[PDB]
Curated annotation (Swiss-Prot), chain C:
The protein's assembly and partners: Component of the small ribosomal subunit.
Role, per record: Component of the small ribosomal subunit. The ribosome is a large ribonucleoprotein complex responsible for the synthesis of proteins in the cell. Required for proper rRNA processing and maturation of 18S rRNAs.
Keywords: Cytoplasm, Metal-binding, Ribonucleoprotein, Ribosomal protein, Zinc, Zinc-finger
Zinc finger (C4-type) boundaries: 37-59
Encoding gene (name): RPS27
Required cofactor names: Zn(2+)
Cofactor info, note text: Binds 1 zinc ion per subunit.
Cell compartment(s), UniProt: Cytoplasm
Pfam families reported for this sequence: Ribosomal_S27e
Protein name (record): Small ribosomal subunit protein eS27
Entry-linked HAMAP family: Ribosomal_eS27
Molecular function as annotated in GO: RNA binding; structural constituent of ribosome; zinc ion binding
Amino acid sequence: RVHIGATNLNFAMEEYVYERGNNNECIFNLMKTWEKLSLAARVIAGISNETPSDVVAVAGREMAHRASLKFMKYTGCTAVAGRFTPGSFTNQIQKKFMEPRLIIVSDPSVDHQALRESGYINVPTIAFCNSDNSLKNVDIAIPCNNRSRLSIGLMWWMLTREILLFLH
Amino acid sequence: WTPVTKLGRLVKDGKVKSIDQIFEFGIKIKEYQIVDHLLPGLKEEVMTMQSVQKQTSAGQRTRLKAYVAIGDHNGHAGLGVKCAKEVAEAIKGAMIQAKLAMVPVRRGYWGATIGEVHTVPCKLTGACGSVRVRLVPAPRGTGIVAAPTPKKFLILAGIEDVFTQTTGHTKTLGNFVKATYDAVRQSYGFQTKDLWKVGGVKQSPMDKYAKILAE
Amino acid sequence: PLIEVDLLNPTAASEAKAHKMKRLVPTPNSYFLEIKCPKCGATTTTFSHAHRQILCQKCGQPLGQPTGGKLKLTQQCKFRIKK
Amino acid sequence: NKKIELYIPRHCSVTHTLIAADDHAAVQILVPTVYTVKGSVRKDGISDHSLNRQFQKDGFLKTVVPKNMMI
Amino acid sequence: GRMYNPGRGISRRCIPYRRSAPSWLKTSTLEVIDEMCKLAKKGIAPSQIGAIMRDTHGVGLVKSVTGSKVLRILKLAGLAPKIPEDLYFLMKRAVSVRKHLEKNKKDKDAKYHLILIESKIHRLTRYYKSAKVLEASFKYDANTASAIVS
Amino acid sequence: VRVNVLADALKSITNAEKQGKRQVMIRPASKVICEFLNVMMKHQYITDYTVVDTHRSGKIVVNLNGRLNKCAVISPRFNVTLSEFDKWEANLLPSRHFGALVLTTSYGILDNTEARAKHTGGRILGFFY
RNA sequence: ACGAUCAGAUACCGUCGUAGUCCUAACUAUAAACGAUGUCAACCAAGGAUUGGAUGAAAACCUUGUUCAGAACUUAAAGAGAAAUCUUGAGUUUAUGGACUUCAGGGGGAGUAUGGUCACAAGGCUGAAACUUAAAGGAAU
RNA sequence: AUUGGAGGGCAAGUCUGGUGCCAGCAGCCGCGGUAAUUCCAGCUCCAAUAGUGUAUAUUAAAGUUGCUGUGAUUAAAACGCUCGUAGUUGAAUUA
RNA sequence: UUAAUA
């Protein structure tokens, strides 16, 4: 049920949304989901092939913790599971000053802190956006469901496969 | 020494030979020692020493706020602000902040391409608080026609000739320098006619040397 | 709007949604139609948004009632669009 | 003698405007070609859609942007 | 917006992009003129005359069939009223408000709106005199308009 | 009420470019509006434009390409003598190589550069950087 | 006018109570008459809801799609401003010019004196000067 | 070789003798109540120089009179509101 | 309930 989105639709996801469902839920275009995902995976694969550590995947919500952690295993990109410390991208004296060249976020609505810091460090961002999410400070958006456990695990596992057990 | 960021490591290894490369790709400078390497022998000039005060139960807490301007005389300038309890340290603290706040200064000619570049290319306006500073291109002979406070800054940036028209509470020393730094800041952001050409494709130094920095 | 569409080739659906004046080339939403009479076979041509009682030319099975924006044709009156 | 310009500034691939040296929100996306997005576009919530037009123009996507938007 | 109040409505008509008569229309100018001619003799305003043709005869635009407007047609037949239609209806409302005001002296909103109506009349009368429609000897008077409007 | 249609058009174009819009629409079209756009095209400030006919002083759609910083009209069109040119350019234009005025003259609507070449003054319309 | 309270209380508290409060006719023409934001016109970021219509679907009332007009509200890393804050502008302004009208020039003296005019009157409209003074004032910590 | 000054605006003394909220200096902020960087003097140097101070007025500074060019929510300032003449400004369109 | 001033 990755195609099924939320009820309220953002103006930036109107293109991806195909037609509202029976009880007023947005239904994403499957081909557009794959087309965006393949493009995003290609961008990640291009950067990560030389230096895996410069791709950072954060996952605030609890049903995205496990999926992101395996993505770290099978690609080497650094993954952030718990809360995102507000300044880990800008405070160089901090001992966990991690520098990305690309950021992947499970949800803009939850991981807004990682997204907003990307406007300070000249780093493009990639997000798994739902029909209600705000498309700010992201550059490649994957229109999908990012609340249900099945969709969160599948999309991360699908993304991991294209770059080259996930369910929370 | 002992770099922490990539750009810090790259300049210490001597791989980014020019500050203009950093400005080209809009990379933030987070170590003042980077500017020291790429722009040696920077002239220095302290604008003012304004003392602020905070009321407390036991009295007042006086701190010294320093506005220092830095920049080589060949098109680079920087303004930094720092406040502390000691004049000596506040200058040093503002000394650091001025270096990370380096900005390119685009300058051009007045009527013909003869000689070297002396004056601003077009009309620029600073956008500080009530103070607003306008810079106009001027012929070769005229010096920096400005108040002493922005004349001191404009001298460092390498602008030999300019016309100025200020507006607002210019008695505010801090905003007066800040307005000049703002007009200079957006010189390279104003798209004139000569900048229409897209030019060629250049490689970012953080992508070409991404492998070595990891290793 | 932040997202922008072509201003020279609007879609058929997009033009239909817009106000009758705010289209690319403004067009009326009204039309001319004829109504076959319930009483006889004659067809009386009239405006879609008529502002008066519509009578047949034969008799007068009144065929429509003007109601603030569109004719309220009787349930037994069949019409077609005059092109 | 010496070159009169410090450097040739980059041009945003969306709005075709210069990228200021202080624009710390401007990104650069490498698609294995170079795409530059100005910081103002990103903060507005449109850079995702603008790149879709440019990606579709270069062929990286085919059935994302509808025809009436393909400008 | 409206001349006298802050209301702002855009309720308009939309002439189609076809200056010629539609294909399905077959009545010639002779029937259109005489049908319009008979309506004018019945004491009907030119604005209402065109509506009757549109609703009943399907002649929605007369300029698309005859090539000349309704008022031009009526002037040629000599059936155009001496007082222009828009000015005539304005003086009909000023008379009606004034009659109500004779018995209801305390109505302060009717006095305001009567002032607005009469200001409109002096605006239209001035224009029509520059357009030579009304002779310069014409002048609107309350003691006189009750009879001519009637 | 609409006093200056050209003022409305140039404000629409400037507003569109500040937002980064690709193309903009101008509802009332005029000869003067078309001439002003033609001058701006000859300097390659706008890609092109098309004029739709609505039988009601139709609309104009202008395509913009990241180059028009600001185009503004000048209120009452002062009678610009040939000796008053450089006084106007010194006030309205950023420098001596970048922008161009627009003047209406008996030889048509021309910018300051070729009006100087044709040796003719006239009323000033506007400018663009 | 009494009675309390208080050092006193011509006030706050309590009791009584004239003009007034109400209607008709005629004056008066002033309010923190405030959105402290002149009138007209163009462009203009995301929304959810509401009042009155038009138009499809779903059997006047109600739930939804579109669109016109009205009083509003929320978000903004954007625009502006001294900031508070404004966004149906207080935006599009040193990159200064869409049209027109009214008003202001440090604080007092002072909306005072005099002159003119309106009113039965109180008062209203117009309205200074001498002299005095380095500040008065606005938003925020 | 003189005139004015040496706290700040504004280049120049935290030198020494007297004076003790007095005399006074002070265009403005202000300094002086006994240890005065500002009074009165001595020495020194600061500016200009056969000129240099003072007083009144014009101009610039003043984008503090605005055409270029101001401000009107809260700093001063949108008529209580509408109608209205003069005045000002007025849609596209003609080979 | 009452509570003024420096």
